[PDB]
Design an enzyme around this catalytic site. Structure first.
Site, PDB file in Angstrom:
ATOM      1  N   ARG A  68       0.850  -1.208   0.000  1.00 13.88           N
ATOM      2  CA  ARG A  68       0.000   0.000   0.000  1.00 13.88           C
ATOM      3  C   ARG A  68       0.877   1.246   0.000  1.00 13.88           C
ATOM      4  NH1 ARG A  68      -2.934   2.766   4.211  1.00 13.88           N
ATOM      5  NH2 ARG A  68      -4.821   3.752   3.416  1.00 13.88           N
ATOM      6  N   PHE A  89       1.782  10.636   1.024  1.00 13.47           N
ATOM      7  CA  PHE A  89       1.302  10.180   2.352  1.00 13.47           C
ATOM      8  C   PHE A  89       2.349   9.249   2.975  1.00 13.47           C
ATOM      9  CE2 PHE A  89      -2.099   7.371   4.562  1.00 13.47           C
ATOM     10  CZ  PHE A  89      -1.810   7.931   5.787  1.00 13.47           C
ATOM     11  N   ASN A 136      -1.848  -0.423  12.405  1.00 10.38           N
ATOM     12  CA  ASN A 136      -2.598  -1.201  13.415  1.00 10.38           C
ATOM     13  C   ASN A 136      -4.040  -1.364  12.941  1.00 10.38           C
ATOM     14  OD1 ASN A 136      -4.164   0.976  14.582  1.00 10.38           O
ATOM     15  ND2 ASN A 136      -2.272   1.719  15.533  1.00 10.38           N
ATOM     16  N   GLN A 163       3.378   1.640   3.097  1.00  7.18           N
ATOM     17  CA  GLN A 163       2.969   0.660   4.102  1.00  7.18           C
ATOM     18  C   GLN A 163       3.486  -0.717   3.678  1.00  7.18           C
ATOM     19  OE1 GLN A 163      -1.197   0.525   4.847  1.00  7.18           O
ATOM     20  NE2 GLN A 163      -0.993  -1.120   6.373  1.00  7.18           N
ATOM     21  N   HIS A 205      -0.897   5.980  16.409  1.00 10.42           N
ATOM     22  CA  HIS A 205       0.150   5.114  15.821  1.00 10.42           C
ATOM     23  C   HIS A 205       1.462   5.358  16.574  1.00 10.42           C
ATOM     24  CE1 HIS A 205      -2.359   3.530  12.620  1.00 10.42           C
ATOM     25  NE2 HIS A 205      -2.982   4.727  12.753  1.00 10.42           N
ATOM     26  N   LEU A 262      -2.272  11.490  12.648  1.00  6.98           N
ATOM     27  CA  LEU A 262      -2.030  10.149  13.241  1.00  6.98           C
ATOM     28  C   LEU A 262      -1.355  10.209  14.626  1.00  6.98           C
ATOM     29  CD1 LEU A 262      -0.969   8.324   9.969  1.00  6.98           C
ATOM     30  CD2 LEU A 262      -3.244   8.533  10.979  1.00  6.98           C
ATOM     31  N   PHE A 291       4.695   1.825   8.512  1.00 10.08           N
ATOM     32  CA  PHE A 291       4.706   2.770   7.406  1.00 10.08           C
ATOM     33  C   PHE A 291       5.882   3.725   7.529  1.00 10.08           C
ATOM     34  CE2 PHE A 291       2.360   6.391   9.456  1.00 10.08           C
ATOM     35  CZ  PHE A 291       1.754   5.740  10.518  1.00 10.08           C
TER      36      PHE A 291
END
EC number: 5.2.1.8
Length: 164
Positions: free
Chosen positions: A54, A59, A101, A62, A125, A121, A112
């Site tokens: 991903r 951004f 998570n 992942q 995270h 976040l 990530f």
């Protein structure tokens, strides 16, 4: 010292280059130990041969699902899941290494690499490291991603270990 670990990154099996990470064992020692052991593969399993499933340009990348290869999988060295150690460290900019998570206390192996400051976040995270060398390799990886996260080519961890 905090440990340093490296990934050698490949695109459909072609060498792309090396990324190295500092792990903040001083502030998140349990979370840092998990990623260090999965990077060495000393226990007989870990990140080597796993994919970044991903990638969303602007951004994050992942990765770390070495069981199911699609974001449903991964396991910590402490069992399937472990607790959020703390939220001391924040998503302060590009290069930040943080745990993916599925809600509170569901840390596994998925992580990530931020390509932006992801402050929304903060507190959700656990941040546990940062890119040290090869932020250009992370910027190259991020070009194989899309708005939904599907990679146009297979982005793999061909090799990994500790430099410390």
């Amino acid at each position: 010292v905090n440990p340093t670990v490296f990934f050698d990154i490949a695109v459909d099996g072609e060498p792309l280059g090396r990324v190295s990470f500092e792990l903040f064992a001083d502030k998140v020692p349990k979370t840092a130990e998990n990623f260090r052991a999965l990077s060495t593969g000393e226990k007989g399993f870990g990140y080597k041969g796993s994919c970044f499933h991903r990638i969303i340009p602007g951004f994050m990348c992942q990765g770390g699902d070495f069981t199911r290869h699609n974001g449903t999988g991964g396991k910590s060295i402490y069992g399937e899941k472990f607790e959020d150690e703390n939220f001391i460290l924040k998503h302060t900019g590009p290069g930040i290494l943080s745990m993916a998570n599925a809600g509170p206390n569901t840390n596994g192996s998925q992580f990530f690499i931020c390509t932006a400051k992801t402050e929304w976040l903060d507190g959700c995270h656990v941040v546990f490291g940062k890119v040290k060398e090869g932020m250009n390799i992370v910027e190259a990886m991020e070009r194989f991603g899309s708005r939904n996260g599907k990679t146009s080519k297979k982005i793999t961890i061909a090799d990994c270990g500790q430099l410390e």
